[PDB]
Every structure is written in structure tokens, then in C-alpha cells.
Design a protein around this ligand. Structure first.
Ligand SMILES: Cc1c(NC(=O)CCc2ccc(Cl)cc2)n[nH]c1-c1cc[n+]([C@@H]2O[C@H](COP(=O)(O)OP(=O)(O)OC[C@H]3O[C@@H](n4cnc5c(N)ncnc54)[C@H](O)[C@@H]3O)[C@@H](O)[C@H]2O)cc1
Ligand SMILES: Cc1c(NC(=O)CCc2ccc(Cl)cc2)n[nH]c1-c1cc[n+]([C@@H]2O[C@H](COP(=O)(O)OP(=O)(O)OC[C@H]3O[C@@H](n4cnc5c(N)ncnc54)[C@H](O)[C@@H]3O)[C@@H](O)[C@H]2O)cc1
Lengths: 140, 140
């Protein structure tokens, strides 16, 4: 059971999500990210089980990363699904903000508007070491 | 004197360039990237001398990364200037392609069209360790 689940938007946050995985592994955390740990079988249940199993939920907020979550009333978007799973399990949610415009809560589905109540970390290209140390402080 | 210079477009490839720095340092290379090794003084001379001092020139080709190079015939764009320096010095140029559309040569200034003659590496999100291993094989 990894200590850290990394949720991210494929087409915009893959590089930062991967950078985060490397840094957190180097500091001794067990990390789940799909390209490394999602293996064979029905991925829907493995993803949900993996979020449920991780103490920390690191949410990579790249530009536009929650755009497809909006209007997703049927919970078809996988970032939406992962966030709701983390909220539902009371996980330690750690948003990582990288050029992301904060949405007004009204625009998000009701089942994930609570994501905006968690203290986020601003990714700093210029002070990446310090950003990483802050993330590690946020982790349980 | 760093062995690897990382040239990248700030607004599109800073995360990949950073991920490349972490991996290359872990495998024991001395890396130059501006946010970690460009310090006090006139940056113009320091950048050119840093390109000169590094045997390997790793060019991060993120989407649109060479757009500001086009029609920059007075060589005022800094990615353009770094590529021209590496070409002039006969450096081991290693392009890393991350969703980059290959330009045709005539849209680039004359002094950097030769960058298309160098064998590039495709960045694979799914096989990142294997991508890193190939980059290391390309390094000198
Ligand atoms: C959904 C999924 C699949 N499915 C298949 O294996 C089908 C194989 C199959 C094909 C044909 C047949 Cl006859 C039978 C079987 N496996 N694992 C995942 C998955 C894993 C993790 N999360 C998490 O959700 C957030 C990302 O959210 P997103 O940004 O939305 O990610 P996606 O865009 O969904 O793409 C994610 C990956 O699926 C690929 N993909 C998606 N659609 C297409 C498409 N139309 N054409 C080509 N490739 C596509 C994409 O290239 C990426 O390799 C993160 O937190 C993740 O941890 C989401 C999805
Ligand atoms: C050019 C430069 C500066 N200059 C200053 O220190 C001025 C300080 C000063 C200010 C006011 C006063 Cl009274 C007196 C002094 N130091 N080091 C660099 C630099 C270093 C390395 N490379 C390489 O070239 C490729 C990237 O190419 P690019 O993507 O084009 O890079 P840039 O877009 O130019 O931004 C790169 C960084 O400069 C910042 N920046 C640029 N313009 C502005 C702007 N209008 N407003 C606010 N910040 C700006 C940006 O926020 C980034 O922190 C890579 O290979 C790099 O190794 C390029 C540039």
C-alpha cells in the first residue's frame, strides 16, 4: 500500500506528476502513479482501491485540469472520480498548483466542491527544492 | 564545469527540463539548468560560456518550443542563441521530443537549420525509465 496517490490530468500534468513521483520516492515515500503501478485487470476498481489505500492524495492542478470535471454530473471523468474517492475516505488531500486558475466552487460538481477547502502548495519552478520540502511537510 | 547543458522553453518545457535534470544528476552527470546554476552577473556571457563548457547539449523540444526562434534572424531569442552556440561548438546535441511537431527547415533561421540533422529521443510518459536509459546512452 503506497503512502501517496498522485492524481493528475494526462494531457497537461504528466510531467509535473512524474517529477513529484521521483522526488517523493527519493525521500522515502511509496507512491502510486498509474503509469508505474496500475497493472493488469479492470482499472476502475484498482484505481478506487488505490486511492482508498493511500494516506495522502496529491492532486496535480495543471492549467485547466478540472475543466472536464465541470458538468460531469454522472462522475465519468477519472480525476473527478479520484477526488470524490479521496474526499469520501477523508484522505489527506494536498493540491499542487502549477499555473492553475482557482475555480469558483459553484462551477464544480457538488460532490467535489470541498476540494477548495484544502490548503494547496504553489509549485515554484525557481525554488523546486523548497517546494518539495513543503510537500513533504504536508505529507503524513 | 557541468557535462550537460539543458536548453528549454520556459513557458512549455520547464517541468520536463527539471525532470531531466533530476534523472541525469541521479545517474551522476553534472547538469546546467538556468534555475539552479545561473547565478549573479551578466547572464548573456554566463549562458554562452555554460553552453561552451558542456560536452552535451540536451534540447527540450516541448510543443511550440521553437516558435519564438522563427524569423528571429537577429538572434535575440535565447533558445535560438543556445542552439547556435551548440552548433558552432560542435557539441553533442541530443533533442528530446515531447509532443513537438518537427518543423521544416525553411521556417527556421539559417544558422539553426542543422539542428534537424541530429538524432532525437522521443519522450515516452509510459516508459520513462527506458527513455532516461536511452538519453544516458546518448550522453558522452
Ligand atoms: C482509462 C484507462 C485505461 N483504459 C484502457 O486501458 C483501455 C484498453 C483497451 C483498448 C481497446 C480495447 Cl478493444 C480493449 C481495451 N487504462 N488505464 C486508465 C486510467 C488510469 C488512471 N487514470 C487516472 O485518471 C486521471 C487521468 O485522467 P485523464 O487525463 O482523463 O486520462 P485519460 O485521458 O483517460 O488517458 C489515460 C490513459 O488512457 C489512455 N486513453 C484514454 N482514452 C484513449 C483513447 N480514446 N485512445 C487512446 N488512448 C486512450 C491515455 O492515452 C492514457 O494512456 C489520473 O489520475 C489517473 O491515475 C485514468 C485512467
Ligand atoms: C533573460 C534572463 C534574465 N533576465 C533578468 O534577470 C532581468 C533582471 C532585471 C529586471 C529588471 C531590472 Cl530594472 C533589472 C534587472 N535572467 N536570466 C535569464 C535567462 C536565463 C536562461 N535562459 C535560457 O533561454 C532559454 C529559455 O528561453 P525563454 O523561454 O525565452 O526564457 P524567458 O521567457 O526569457 O524567461 C526566463 C526568465 O526571465 C524571466 N523573464 C523574462 N522576461 C521577463 C519579463 N518581461 N518580466 C518578468 N520576467 C521575465 C522569466 O520569468 C524567467 O524567470 C533556456 O534555455 C535558458 O537557459 C534565458 C534567459
Amino acid at each position: 500500500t503506497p503512502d501517496v496517490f498522485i492524481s493528475y490530468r494526462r494531457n497537461s500534468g504528466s510531467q509535473l506528476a512524474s517529477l513529484l513521483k521521483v522526488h517523493l520516492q527519493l525521500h522515502g515515500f511509496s507512491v502510486f502513479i498509474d503509469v508505474e503501478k496500475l497493472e493488469a485487470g479492470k482499472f476502475e476498481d484498482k484505481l478506487i482501491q488505490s486511492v482508498m489505500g493511500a494516506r495522502n492524495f496529491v492532486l496535480v492542478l495543471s492549467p485547466g485540469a478540472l475543466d472536464k470535471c465541470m458538468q460531469d454530473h454522472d462522475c465519468k471523468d477519472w480525476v473527478h472520480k479520484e477526488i470524490v474517492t479521496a474526499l469520501s475516505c477523508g484522505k489527506n488531500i494536498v493540491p499542487i498548483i502549477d499555473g492553475f486558475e482557482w475555480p469558483e466552487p459553484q462551477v464544480l460538481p457538488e460532490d467535489m466542491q470541498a476540494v477548495l477547502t484544502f490548503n494547496g502548495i504553489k509549485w515554484s519552478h525557481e525554488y523546486q527544492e523548497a517546494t518539495i520540502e513543503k510537500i513533504i511537510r504536508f505529507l503524513q
